[PDB]
Amino acid sequence: AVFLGFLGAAGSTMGAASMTLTVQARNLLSGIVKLTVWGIKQLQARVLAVERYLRDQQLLGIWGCSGKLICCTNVPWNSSWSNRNLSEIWDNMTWLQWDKEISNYTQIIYGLLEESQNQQEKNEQDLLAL
């Protein structure tokens, strides 16, 4: 491997950028290090940092992906979203090119992942009722 750094594979293939996720998983929250200009403006930025982060953790939690960097689910890939082959995606276009093609259907997928999780712990609720 080569430590490309933060967003080092932004122009690389989705198969190469998918193996370096814990690099952008650290610097998404950074860390730790009173009334003036930047003082109030720094605290406003520190709050926004944890809000956007908890939204991505809350969304991951209600999908059953809480704690996963790569998470497999039940929702099948609808051909209307992207009728592209598996080899022309992971070894071709980048994650930036991918988000533009899925920008439309990305809201429908987020709802399919939620009920696919609620209708899984509810099934397991009956699976442990005996």
Binding site: A16, D91, L96
Partner: protein, 128 residues
Amino acid sequence: QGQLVQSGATTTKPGSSVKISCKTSGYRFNFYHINWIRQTAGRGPEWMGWISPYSGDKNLAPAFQDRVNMTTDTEVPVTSFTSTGAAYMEIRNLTSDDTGTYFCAKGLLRDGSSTWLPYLWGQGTLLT
């Protein structure tokens, strides 16, 4: 998902050299190899060789290593995923046996076991 227009049909005589261009568009020129293939009157098709617009690396058949002059420029980026590049082609010891139609070809993928496979072809250039 872009075009690869070439030069015209320039006809010379044996012993000389011919320059063939290949102007790309509609795709990131530095992300895919540029293969060169010809179909001469005497054989079928023959793979000449490809070159990497990113690594600048060459790999060509031994039947054309001591004849082919193969170079590329540097893309003029249009957008984030679009650019405009150029691939050049020249031969050395020319004969009437090399008479045929020549085209460039953009590589297949950006990774894997078929990274350079000629996918998107040009239009054709008739030689001597």
